[PDB]
Amino acid sequence: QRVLVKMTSRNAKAVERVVAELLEHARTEKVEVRGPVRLPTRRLRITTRKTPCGNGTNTWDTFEMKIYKRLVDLRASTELVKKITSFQIEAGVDVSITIP
Amino acid sequence: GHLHQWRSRQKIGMGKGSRHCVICSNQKALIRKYELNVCRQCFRENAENIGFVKLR
Amino acid sequence: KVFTKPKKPIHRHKLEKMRALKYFKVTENSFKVERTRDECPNPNCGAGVFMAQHKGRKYCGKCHLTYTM
Amino acid sequence: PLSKKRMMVRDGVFYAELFEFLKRELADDGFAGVEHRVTPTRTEIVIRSTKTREVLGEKGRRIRELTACLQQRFNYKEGKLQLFAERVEVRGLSAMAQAESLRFKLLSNLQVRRAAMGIIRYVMESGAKGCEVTIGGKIKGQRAKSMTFRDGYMIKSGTAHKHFVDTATRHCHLRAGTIGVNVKIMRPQSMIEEDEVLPDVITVIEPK
Amino acid sequence: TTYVPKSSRDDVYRFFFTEGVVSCKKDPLGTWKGTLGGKTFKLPTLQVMQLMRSLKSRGLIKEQFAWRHFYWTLNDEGINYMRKYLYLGADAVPNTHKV
RNA sequence: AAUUGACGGAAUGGCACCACAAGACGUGGAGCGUGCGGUUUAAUUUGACCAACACGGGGAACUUUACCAGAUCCGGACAGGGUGAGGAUUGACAGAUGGAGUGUUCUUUCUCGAUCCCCUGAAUGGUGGUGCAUGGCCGCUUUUGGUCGGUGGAGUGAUUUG
RNA sequence: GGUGAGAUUUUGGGCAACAGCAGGUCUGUGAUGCUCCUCAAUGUUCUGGGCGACACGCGCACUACAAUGUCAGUGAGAACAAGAGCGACGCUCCCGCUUGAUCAAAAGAGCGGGGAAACCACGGAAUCACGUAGACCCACUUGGGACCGAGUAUUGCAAUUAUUGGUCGCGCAACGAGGAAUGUCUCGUAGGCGCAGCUCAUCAAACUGUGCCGAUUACGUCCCU
Ligand SMILES: [K+]
Ligand SMILES: [K+]
Ligand SMILES: [K+]
Ligand SMILES: [K+]
Ligand SMILES: [K+]
Ligand SMILES: [K+]
Ligand SMILES: [K+]
Ligand SMILES: [K+]
Ligand SMILES: [Mg+2]
Ligand SMILES: [Mg+2]
Ligand SMILES: [Mg+2]
Ligand SMILES: [Mg+2]
Ligand SMILES: [Mg+2]
Ligand SMILES: [Mg+2]
Ligand SMILES: [Mg+2]
Ligand SMILES: [Mg+2]
Ligand SMILES: [Mg+2]
Ligand SMILES: [Mg+2]
Ligand SMILES: [Mg+2]
Ligand SMILES: [Mg+2]
Ligand SMILES: [Mg+2]
Ligand SMILES: [Mg+2]
Ligand SMILES: [Mg+2]
Ligand SMILES: [Mg+2]
Ligand SMILES: [Mg+2]
Ligand SMILES: [Mg+2]
Ligand SMILES: [Mg+2]
Ligand SMILES: [Zn+2]
Structure with a gap:
């Protein structure tokens, strides 16, 4: 456990492309990788009355937001990590690098 | 000393009277979950842009 | 709708015509000019600020510092 | 350091305010949407428009004014925010642009039916599969009613109709009251992902 | 509190x-x-x-409002007025006027 | 005299636990929590009467607050007329006055220095009215299987076929 | 009937046409036409009251009328979730372990952890179980807990018209299964049992979700609506 890369997004397709291409860069250099880990997906929920005034049958709306997280572990030297993760990210994906 | 008295209670900053909707400044039926601070009527109109989707 | 009280007056500022002729006294002694009022010792006020000299106390217009006899 | 779920909510709230500020400011100009992206060196915001020259202004005066507004509001550091303008390939397939064009025509004292039929005819020529225009209010005297004008296909139920139908609503403030307009455009290809088939269409490949 | 001193007016x-x-x-x-x-x-x-x-x-200001925030912009007449008021040279222009 | 609806303690064929049948657990009787009406009150702010009545996300100590008894501020931009550096105006210690040992006003005399002040228009703000002037949204008709053109056929026609 | 994890829209939801209603909302908005007030103001703020006040009628909940029980012990055992930057040098939210303790609860104080699959946490929920050789024995009774008295600690700028929690008294307040009338429901459902979120400085007999124990009856009809 030298470098931990954590990616989170609200778009499932976007977060998979970032993970897959990051693995591509690591393999093209031949740096050892602990396979990507799919952390539990979270749902944020809000329930509100539909009416703006409070008349009629009491009906409700349910709104949901899904958050996807992926974890990739790399064991590589210092300057090698910046080279590997220097590429640009798609919109809506947050990437964080942590040294445990 | 009338300026010391002008908005003395509003300066304390506690209770329902210290919170405003960040869109319309109304003080009724706020949604405080996840620190949203949007009233329930304004949330329904802006829920799509914020990122909430009706699925179930 | 009925108040049963005299109406509030509004303050308005009292005008002292040529008020700067006081606070200064000139003597023939070429003339020598001395100030007839005291300055506020508060560092933030300065030498251009005078004291009210009420009947029984001295008062500063801006700092509101008061000296009672 | 804020948690991940708090950061996702904050980003959505920022985008919603930016969208509302732009649609109020860029009204009377073709406004079709905004894309916001974060980079290590700066933050990029792309504004989609039908009249790009109107958005840019003389030289780049108008677009620099918009940058100064956003930088001050969100406390952006100098050189950390940049704005771009790009044009829509097909103006007639944008529900937001068509609704604001209709609102301008109504304020210019035009007949309701003539104005609505003009938008529908332009959209159909642009290559849409269907169009729907609804106008409601005191169009006649003193008693509110509503009309609808239709053409072509349209789907209204299920979930797939959100990937294919573009809709927008606007308010028009006349001297006797407010009148609402709503425009729906059914587009070829999905707005979400291209090469997507309709939910209930089956095709059989011809044998070799 | 709406009594604006002259020094603050000039800075704004x-x-x-x-x-x-x-x-x-x-x-x-x-x-x-x-x-x-x-x-x-x-x-x-x-x-x-x-x-x-x-x-x-x-007629010197354009105003916009959205989500509890004001946005004020100078127009050409306002630019002229501010130049005389601040005693600036005729070649002076705001930012956003410079490429 | 004909046409389309609605209705029938007139027929035909179906359907539904917001219908029944076979049953279960309850409510209606008691205490208490909460909402509505009424009475009282200075005020007990107010909307709504299957599809109003733990509904207005309405579990209100102050705030919220819209009601009642009193006190302050201008947040009356701008335009015209007038006072105005020989001073237009702001604020205030101490004593009384007000419920009020942070000038509301009064006595007193310092402070600020063209930001105002007085008069006339206009303009602003309003949880003020009017939802029977409106937009948007929501409820219900209506949880069932229903709706509409084009061209052609029938009728003087309303209409009908599909 | 078979094959099968599952056998009929697989099981639950979401979406949902065309025509309307003088249904509701001008108390959501910098949505809005006419109209009203506009400097002793229907604008705004501050102090104090009220929104709750009680001879009564009505809707909806919670707790019971006991032994298929109440009280006191021992045993095993869930899911959904949440959590921190104006006014007072960082802090401000949610928890754990010690200590207080040579003597109640409720507090107070030290030391730590968590940005939440890393803390709380091996998540010791309540119905439940016990060959516990436990207490009670058909009575308005150790059923039931309304009403009321006295002392305490905490939230808050402020607790009187008791904010809330905890302690000892009151239990001689009804209530012993509820007339006419009436609601919901077909399988992990009804009923019973708790927990989290939300509103929230402090308060849940409410609502929105979640799990636990777990049935009787029908597989029809057009008699009533
Ligand atoms: K049928
Ligand atoms: K119903
Ligand atoms: K309406
Ligand atoms: K025909
Ligand atoms: K109105
Ligand atoms: K009430
Ligand atoms: K009633
Ligand atoms: K409630
Ligand atoms: Mg279809
Ligand atoms: Mg369907
Ligand atoms: Mg006849
Ligand atoms: Mg019934
Ligand atoms: Mg009862
Ligand atoms: Mg019905
Ligand atoms: Mg309360
Ligand atoms: Mg008050
Ligand atoms: Mg008011
Ligand atoms: Mg208003
Ligand atoms: Mg109306
Ligand atoms: Mg109306
Ligand atoms: Mg109506
Ligand atoms: Mg219905
Ligand atoms: Mg024909
Ligand atoms: Mg007991
Ligand atoms: Mg006790
Ligand atoms: Mg007790
Ligand atoms: Mg007893
Ligand atoms: Zn001084």
Whole structure:
């Protein structure tokens, strides 16, 4: 456990492309990788009355937001990590690098 | 000393009277979950842009 | 709708015509000019600020510092 | 350091305010949407428009004014925010642009039916599969009613109709009251992902 | 609190001309912060609103509002007025006028 | 005299636990929590009467607050007329006055220094009215299987076929 | 009937046409036309009251009328979730372990952890179980807990018209299964049992979700609506 890369997004397709291409860069250099880990997906929920005034049958709306997280572990030297993760990210994906 | 008295209670900053909707400044039926601070009527109109989707 | 009280007056500022002729006294002694009022010792006020000299106390217009006899 | 779920909510709230500020400011100009992206060196915001020259202004005066507004509001550091303008390939397939064009025509004292039929005819020529225009209010005297004008296909139920139908609503403030307009455009290809088939269409490949 | 001293009026006008845009939050118990080549200055939100309201009654200001925030922009007539008021040279223009 | 609806303690064929049948657990009787009406009150702010009545996300100590008894501020921009650096105006210690040892006003005399002040228009703000002037949204008709053109056929026609 | 994890829209939801209603909302908005007030103001703020006040009628909940029980012990055992930057040098939210303790609860104080699959946490929920050789024995009784008295600690700028929690008294307040009338429901459902979120400085007999124990009856009809 030298470098931990954590990616989170609200778009499932976007977060998979970032993970897959990051693995591509690591393999093209031949740096050892602990396979990507799919952390539990979270749902944020809000329930509100539909009416703006409070008349009629009491009906409700349910709104949901899904958050996807992926974890990739790399064991590589210092300057090698910046080279590997220097590429640009798609919109809506947050990437964080942590040294445990 | 009338300026010391002008908005003395509003300066304390506690209770329902210290919170405003960040869109319309109304003080009724706020949604405080996840620190949203949007009233329930304004949330329904802006829920799509914020990122909430009706699925179930 | 009925108040049963005299109406509030509004303050308005009292005008002292040529008020700067006081606070200064000139003597023939070429003339020598001395100030007839005291300055506020508060560092933030300065030498251009005078004291009210009420009947029984001295008062500063801006700092509101008061000296009672 | 804020948690991940708090950061996702904050980003959505920022985008919603930016969208509302732009649609109020860029009204009377073709406004079709905004894309916001974060980079290590700066933050990029792309504004989609039908009249790009109107958005840019003389030289780049108008677009620099918009940058100064956003930088001050969100406390952006100098050189950390940049704005771009790009044009829509097909103006007639944008529900937001068509609704604001209709609102301008109504304020210019035009007949309701003539104005609505003009938008529908332009959209159909642009290559849409269907169009729907609804106008409601005191169009006649003193008693509110509503009309609808239709053409072509349209789907209204299920979930797939959100990937294919573009809709927008606007308010028009006349001297006797407010009148609402709503425009729906059914587009070829999905707005979400291209090469997507309709939910209930089956095709059989011809044998070799 | 709506009594604006002359020194604060000149600082706000000078910041306005240099940038060309002023943004403020509608809040009676608020403070507005700005910088003029360093040397940050502050004044109550109510005083900023009074100055902009007077400018908008004249034909020198364009105003926009969205989500509890003001946005003020100078127009060509306002640029002319500010130049005489601040005794600037005829070649002076706000920012956003320079490529 | 004909046409389309609605209705029938007139027929035909189906359907539904917001219908029944076979049953279960309850409510209606008691205490208490909460909402509505009434009475009382200075005020007990107010909307709504299957599809109003733990509904207005309405579990209100102050705030919220819209009601009642009193006190302050201008947040009346701008335009015209007038006072105005020989001073237009702001604020205030101490004593009284007000419920109020942070000038509301009064006595007193310092402070600020063209930001105002007085008069006339205009303009702003309003949880003020009017939802029977409106937009948007929601409820219900209506949880069932229903709706509409084009061209062609029938009728003087309303209409009908599909 | 078979094959099968599952056998009929697989099981639950979401979406849902065309025509309307003088249904509701001008108390959501910098949505809005006419109209009203506009400097002793229907604008705004501050102090104090009220929104709750009680001879009564009505809707909806919670707790019971006991032994298929109450009280006191021992045993095993869930899911959904949440959590921190104006006014007072960082802090401000949610928890754990010690200590207080040579003597109640409720507090107070030290030391730590968590940005939440890393803390709380091996998540010791309540119905439940016990060959516990436990207490009670058909009575308005150790059923039931309304009403009321006295002392305490905490939230808050402020607790009187008791904010809330905890302690000892009151239990001689009804209530012993509820007339006419009436609601919901077909399988992990009804009923019973708790927990989290939300509103929230402090308060849940409410609502929105979640799990636990777990049935009787029908597989029809057009008699009533
Ligand atoms: K049938
Ligand atoms: K119903
Ligand atoms: K309406
Ligand atoms: K026909
Ligand atoms: K109105
Ligand atoms: K009430
Ligand atoms: K009633
Ligand atoms: K409630
Ligand atoms: Mg279809
Ligand atoms: Mg369907
Ligand atoms: Mg006849
Ligand atoms: Mg019934
Ligand atoms: Mg009863
Ligand atoms: Mg019905
Ligand atoms: Mg309360
Ligand atoms: Mg009050
Ligand atoms: Mg008011
Ligand atoms: Mg209003
Ligand atoms: Mg109406
Ligand atoms: Mg109306
Ligand atoms: Mg109506
Ligand atoms: Mg219905
Ligand atoms: Mg024909
Ligand atoms: Mg007991
Ligand atoms: Mg006790
Ligand atoms: Mg007790
Ligand atoms: Mg007893
Ligand atoms: Zn002094």
